[PDB]
Amino acid sequence: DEVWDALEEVIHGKVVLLNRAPTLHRLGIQAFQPVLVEGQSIQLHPLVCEAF
Amino acid sequence: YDGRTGEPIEGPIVVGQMFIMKLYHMVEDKMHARSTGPYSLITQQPLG
Amino acid sequence: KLKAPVFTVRTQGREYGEFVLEPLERGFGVTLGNPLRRILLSSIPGTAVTSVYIEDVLHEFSTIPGVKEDVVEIILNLKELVVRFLNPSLQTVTLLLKAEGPKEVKARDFLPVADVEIMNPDLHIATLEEGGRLNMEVRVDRGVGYVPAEKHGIKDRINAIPVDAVFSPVRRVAFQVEDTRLGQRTDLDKLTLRIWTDGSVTPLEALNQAVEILREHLTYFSNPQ
Amino acid sequence: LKAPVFTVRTQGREYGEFVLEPLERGFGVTLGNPLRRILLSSIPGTAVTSVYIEDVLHEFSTIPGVKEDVVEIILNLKELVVRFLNPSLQTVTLLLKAEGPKEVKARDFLPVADVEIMNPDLHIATLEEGGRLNMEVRVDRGVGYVPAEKHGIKDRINAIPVDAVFSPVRRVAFQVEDTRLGQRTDLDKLTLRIWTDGSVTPLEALNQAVEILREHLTYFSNPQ
Amino acid sequence: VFANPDEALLAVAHGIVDLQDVVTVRYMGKRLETSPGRILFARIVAEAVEDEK
Amino acid sequence: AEPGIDKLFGMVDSKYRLTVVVAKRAQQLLRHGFKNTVLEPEERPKMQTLEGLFDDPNAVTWAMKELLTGRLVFGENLVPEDRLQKEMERLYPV
Amino acid sequence: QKRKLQVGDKLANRHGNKGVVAKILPVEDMPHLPDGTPVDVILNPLGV
Ligand SMILES: [Mg+2]
């Protein structure tokens, strides 16, 4: 369980790039600060769905 | 009624029994990640 | 079982405060936040103006000659008045105000009544000019919640205008539930309670009174039949 | 307002009605909902957590002479209601030994001290002539819903973890009427309806729910 | 006729009026003939930007 | 949004110059172990850890907050590259 | 493996309405009938 605590310190301040195909415009790739969540699905903000 | 507050929903809600299917596309079989792994023979690029 | 949560308070001034309770079991932020908000907005004892009498005024939709504010605006300012009774046995007082133009009438212009404190003496009531006379008698009661003027319909004398009684000192309640973790438990709840109060009572006191009211009602489930 | 009168109407050990009147306007929801949330979530009870069947290695197998497979048998065992008559009892193992042809029920478990089966007529498996069913069902005490993947309790090598639904409360509804006292007619009449599996009476579940809320209200005492 | 948005929303919380009912609310020093919901929307924007004017 | 991002964009004529300044400053901070920072001890970025409140290891976060203070000088042909690297090592040993 | 319904699994009905499970709520959080029966699935009316 201490590994998961160390993973939080790894991703602190860092961002990841989220991309949905097809990338018709540049906002098809956007940077988000990842929040670690239980499960296997990526949680996406409702307000960026239109751009993607 | 709203289970969180106990107050009713301000308008009547269409509530009924409907037949819903669970499809073969599951996030368990679709989630994938890789840091480093196998590479191509010629292009030396990561496999897919 | 989950460890007892930490109750942290962030109170600024005497009219606003934030209270955080974490960690909580899943769903207990909603379980606790909603009852307290309902009690805070409807059950905290307070004082309010319930009737006003102004000389030479017949109806609420009229206006006094010699003052910028009409009857409605003065009534609206009266609803902003915050008064705190210093005597627990005291139930109702009447505040007298005699003003001559061209002064700006304030809440401090009310005649001092024993065991009666005006929390906001800088509140603006009316603005007078030369030849303007404002003779006003306001009736202050004790109660809870919000009561429309037409509901209680309190009149001390003829031509008295009933006014909406904002008894509750709590101006606004907003509670937020956030997901928190304690080790490998990830479904825990973080409850943040934000209370706005008129200043007669501290938001900490309002929360304490609301918790006591909820606690007292839980003792009602004691003696069957 | 004066102290409300509390009225209790019970239909056996599984259903009960609790009336609290008169209450101020808005206290029907203010009191009913928190209890309903606590009743539906945080009431301790008993549930089957692990089952071991002789000559069975996993739950994805069938037993000769038994009509139902292990998955269906485990589904039947999830409906078993076990009442611990001893408050200090935390774990019990129920032993079932049956030989075909018979319809083995929940009443066929070997008797255990301070343990009562609230639904003896529950169907577990159908035994055909020449079929045998030797099971060791472990019943634990807990709160909430614990999937088998979390607790992973195996009393022995071939024991099969079972998803545990410890909550005895089956359904909660609370009802608010237009009651009147004196000259004021906005008062609330709160009626709590509790359905429980029978291991815990609805009166006991209500008492525990009140205590849980009362304890949580003591958390607002010491500011930091 | 409400003296402030807090009083108007307190009445909504107490069930006297709905968010869509047109009432009189004094806001920004102006006597507005609007609904509490429209007044509520104004407070949403004001608190989000931390600037009421 | 990044804190003070509007102020960061207003200090540069091209938005990509801001990124270059932040990224170059971040590697300067990483190279010297955050000992060359212009932030006061009460101004250092922090992260919440179970053990306690510790310094933020993300140098990009440090670089952005340093630029907001105004103690950093950026531009083209300010100092020779060889002279810059050598002098920083002397006054900030690592 | 015995797969239970989880967040990200795709559900659908016979009328072309499809979607992934995005949230799993406790029983006390779901909207319920006045008799105390909670609903099982909440569907967005905007998809109709
Ligand atoms: Mg059960």
Side-chain angles (χ1 to χ4, degrees):
Chain A
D1 302 313
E2 294 68 28
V3 169
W4 301 114
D5 291 331
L7 185 52
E8 292 277 4
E9 308 180 18
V10 174
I11 66 146
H12 188 75
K14 281 181 182 289
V15 291
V16 294
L17 294 188
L18 288 189
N19 174 235
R20 179 190 170 271
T23 317
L24 305 174
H25 55 178
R26 81 184 182 187
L27 282 73
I29 304 187
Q30 302 186 41
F32 303 89
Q33 293 180 357
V35 179
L36 294 183
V37 294
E38 311 288 338
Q40 312 202 230
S41 312
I42 299 153
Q43 304 172 354
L44 187 77
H45 198 280
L47 291 175
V48 305
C49 291
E50 169 185 350
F52 285 110
Chain B
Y1 297 151
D2 189 1
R4 292 126 65 202
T5 62
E7 294 144 43
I9 309 290
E10 293 179 354
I13 305 296
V14 172
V15 176
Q17 185 177 3
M18 184 178 72
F19 174 84
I20 293 183
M21 294 180 286
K22 177 187 186 184
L23 304 195
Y24 171 81
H25 306 292
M26 297 177 186
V27 64
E28 166 149 37
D29 305 322
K30 301 200 171 190
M31 175 185 110
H32 173 52
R34 158 207 172 113
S35 51
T36 57
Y39 295 99
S40 178
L41 268 171
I42 308 183
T43 61
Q44 287 297 327
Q45 292 171 7
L47 297 178
Chain C
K1 73 168 191 179
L2 209 46
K3 184 178 179 180
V6 176
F7 179 59
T8 49
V9 298
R10 330 160 183 167
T11 50
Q12 64 182 358
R14 207 176 195 262
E15 282 162 297
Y16 176 70
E18 311 185 0
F19 317 103
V20 188
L21 196 68
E22 65 181 1
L24 284 166
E25 266 296 356
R26 182 192 70 170
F28 272 77
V30 193
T31 297
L32 290 185
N34 277 274
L36 290 181
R37 174 185 168 278
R38 295 176 60 94
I39 299 182
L40 287 174
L41 288 181
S42 55
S43 302
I44 306 303
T47 63
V49 181
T50 78
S51 178
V52 63
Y53 176 72
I54 298 169
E55 193 84 350
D56 289 345
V57 173
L58 277 297
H59 60 99
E60 170 199 355
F61 300 110
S62 61
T63 187
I64 297 90
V67 56
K68 299 184 180 176
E69 294 83 3
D70 61 357
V71 173
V72 172
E73 187 72 4
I74 304 183
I75 286 179
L76 285 194
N77 279 122
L78 285 184
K79 294 207 295 187
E80 294 293 328
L81 180 56
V82 179
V83 61
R84 209 182 53 191
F85 294 146
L86 285 185
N87 175 339
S89 299
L90 184 53
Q91 199 72 225
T92 295
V93 298
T94 185
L95 304 183
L96 274 66
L97 181 156
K98 296 183 290 294
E100 295 85 357
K103 68 176 73 174
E104 293 179 353
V105 189
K106 298 291 184 181
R108 67 180 66 252
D109 305 340
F110 282 118
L111 294 175
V113 176
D115 285 290
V116 174
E117 156 161 349
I118 302 287
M119 295 299 291
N120 48 2
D122 276 336
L123 180 80
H124 181 241
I125 296 302
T127 313
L128 294 174
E129 292 83 3
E130 180 65 26
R133 297 293 299 274
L134 182 68
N135 290 318
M136 182 178 71
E137 280 162 16
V138 299
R139 154 170 186 94
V140 182
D141 290 345
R142 204 183 207 119
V144 306
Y146 178 68
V147 174
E150 57 266 16
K151 264 194 51 188
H152 68 76
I154 278 165
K155 303 183 177 180
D156 281 354
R157 39 201 311 184
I158 193 66
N159 290 359
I161 309 176
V163 60
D164 290 345
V166 177
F167 291 116
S168 66
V170 166
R171 287 279 181 261
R172 164 191 183 184
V173 179
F175 80 95
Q176 173 187 4
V177 179
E178 293 179 353
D179 289 345
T180 184
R181 60 175 183 182
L182 210 70
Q184 280 321 96
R185 291 191 82 132
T186 56
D187 57 9
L188 305 195
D189 276 351
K190 170 193 171 180
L191 169 79
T192 303
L193 193 69
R194 304 184 174 79
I195 310 175
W196 293 256
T197 306
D198 68 12
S200 43
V201 308
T202 300
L204 193 61
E205 295 169 76
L207 180 54
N208 292 342
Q209 299 191 30
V211 164
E212 171 67 5
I213 292 179
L214 194 51
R215 189 199 67 64
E216 175 77 5
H217 278 65
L218 292 182
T219 73
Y220 294 161
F221 293 108
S222 60
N223 297 115
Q225 298 147 317
Chain D
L1 184 63
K2 201 73 63 177
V5 64
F6 185 53
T7 300
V8 178
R9 297 176 300 242
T10 59
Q11 294 182 9
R13 295 178 46 88
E14 293 179 353
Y15 180 64
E17 293 184 2
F18 313 93
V19 166
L20 193 65
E21 73 163 323
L23 295 165
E24 299 288 358
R25 188 268 298 164
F27 289 166
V29 187
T30 303
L31 289 191
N33 197 223
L35 298 191
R36 176 181 185 273
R37 300 180 52 86
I38 293 172
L39 285 177
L40 288 183
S41 63
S42 297
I43 297 301
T46 70
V48 169
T49 47
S50 193
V51 55
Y52 161 80
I53 310 169
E54 174 174 331
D55 294 346
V56 179
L57 312 185
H58 43 256
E59 64 179 317
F60 306 102
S61 52
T62 72
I63 312 176
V66 185
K67 171 183 172 184
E68 300 88 358
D69 61 357
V70 175
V71 174
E72 199 167 317
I73 295 183
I74 287 183
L75 285 185
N76 294 341
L77 288 185
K78 288 179 62 182
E79 293 177 350
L80 183 58
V81 176
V82 187
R83 171 190 169 189
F84 295 175
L85 315 159
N86 189 359
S88 59
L89 198 58
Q90 295 298 109
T91 294
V92 72
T93 303
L94 310 174
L95 316 172
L96 186 151
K97 294 181 177 67
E99 293 177 350
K102 74 170 309 163
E103 293 179 354
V104 61
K105 312 285 191 187
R107 77 176 66 262
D108 296 343
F109 283 109
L110 291 187
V112 183
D114 294 334
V115 174
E116 170 181 347
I117 302 298
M118 289 307 297
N119 50 6
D121 308 298
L122 175 58
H123 178 273
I124 290 182
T126 298
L127 288 194
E128 174 212 343
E129 169 59 286
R132 293 182 183 174
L133 192 58
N134 180 12
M135 291 195 313
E136 296 186 6
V137 182
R138 157 167 176 167
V139 177
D140 291 331
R141 167 180 278 165
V143 298
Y145 161 64
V146 187
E149 293 83 3
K150 289 183 178 179
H151 62 78
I153 306 184
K154 296 183 289 294
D155 263 13
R156 62 176 49 189
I157 298 85
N158 284 346
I160 305 178
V162 176
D163 307 84
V165 180
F166 297 103
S167 180
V169 169
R170 270 181 193 148
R171 175 148 61 88
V172 177
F174 71 96
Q175 185 68 40
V176 180
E177 292 84 2
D178 213 24
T179 190
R180 69 181 299 110
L181 183 63
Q183 296 294 321
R184 63 182 294 166
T185 177
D186 48 341
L187 295 175
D188 273 9
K189 182 173 73 69
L190 168 65
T191 299
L192 272 163
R193 314 210 294 164
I194 306 172
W195 288 266
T196 311
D197 61 7
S199 46
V200 187
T201 68
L203 183 49
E204 297 172 46
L206 178 60
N207 289 331
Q208 305 188 26
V210 164
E211 180 81 7
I212 292 176
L213 193 62
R214 182 205 69 64
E215 292 177 350
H216 272 68
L217 289 177
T218 66
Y219 297 162
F220 286 99
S221 52
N222 49 353
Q224 297 294 0
Chain E
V1 185
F2 298 106
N4 51 71
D6 274 338
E7 183 192 352
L9 291 179
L10 181 67
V12 177
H14 280 254
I16 295 90
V17 286
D18 284 341
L19 285 183
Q20 298 80 10
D21 293 343
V22 177
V23 295
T24 302
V25 187
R26 182 163 100 270
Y27 185 49
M28 306 285 295
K30 194 158 311 308
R31 188 172 301 175
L32 307 169
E33 286 183 347
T34 61
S35 62
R38 285 178 178 180
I39 284 297
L40 181 54
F41 177 79
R43 187 179 74 186
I44 295 161
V45 178
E47 294 187 338
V49 305
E50 307 187 26
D51 189 349
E52 184 178 1
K53 301 183 177 186
Chain F
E2 299 297 296
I5 185 62
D6 300 319
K7 184 176 183 292
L8 295 180
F9 277 132
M11 293 183 286
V12 300
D13 61 357
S14 163
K15 73 191 263 192
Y16 312 103
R17 168 163 283 119
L18 163 66
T19 296
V20 168
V21 174
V22 166
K24 288 198 180 185
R25 184 48 178 181
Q27 298 162 201
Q28 292 186 10
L29 280 177
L30 284 184
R31 200 190 306 111
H32 295 250
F34 290 110
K35 302 274 190 168
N36 46 353
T37 192
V38 304
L39 291 184
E40 286 155 356
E42 69 275 16
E43 293 179 353
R44 299 160 82 82
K46 303 279 182 178
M47 66 178 289
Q48 182 61 63
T49 305
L50 294 174
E51 317 181 2
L53 184 63
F54 298 138
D55 270 343
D56 207 318
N58 187 220
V60 176
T61 301
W62 284 65
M64 285 198 219
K65 186 176 180 180
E66 288 189 337
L67 213 58
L68 280 183
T69 62
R71 300 162 192 132
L72 292 185
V73 176
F74 59 98
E76 310 201 304
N77 288 106
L78 285 188
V79 297
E81 298 195 76
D82 290 330
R83 200 49 199 270
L84 182 62
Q85 294 179 357
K86 183 178 179 180
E87 175 93 20
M88 293 177 70
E89 293 291 329
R90 175 179 75 67
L91 191 152
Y92 304 115
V94 60
Chain G
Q1 57 207 285
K2 180 162 59 181
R3 297 185 180 179
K4 316 183 65 56
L5 195 49
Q6 60 176 235
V7 172
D9 283 3
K10 186 175 191 184
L11 302 189
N13 64 24
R14 294 168 290 184
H15 312 278
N17 185 2
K18 76 219 182 191
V20 296
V21 181
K23 184 71 170 181
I24 291 177
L25 300 172
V27 62
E28 85 268 353
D29 273 8
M30 304 281 296
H32 58 282
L33 297 180
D35 59 89
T37 308
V39 301
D40 291 330
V41 177
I42 314 183
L43 293 187
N44 199 331
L46 280 71
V48 171

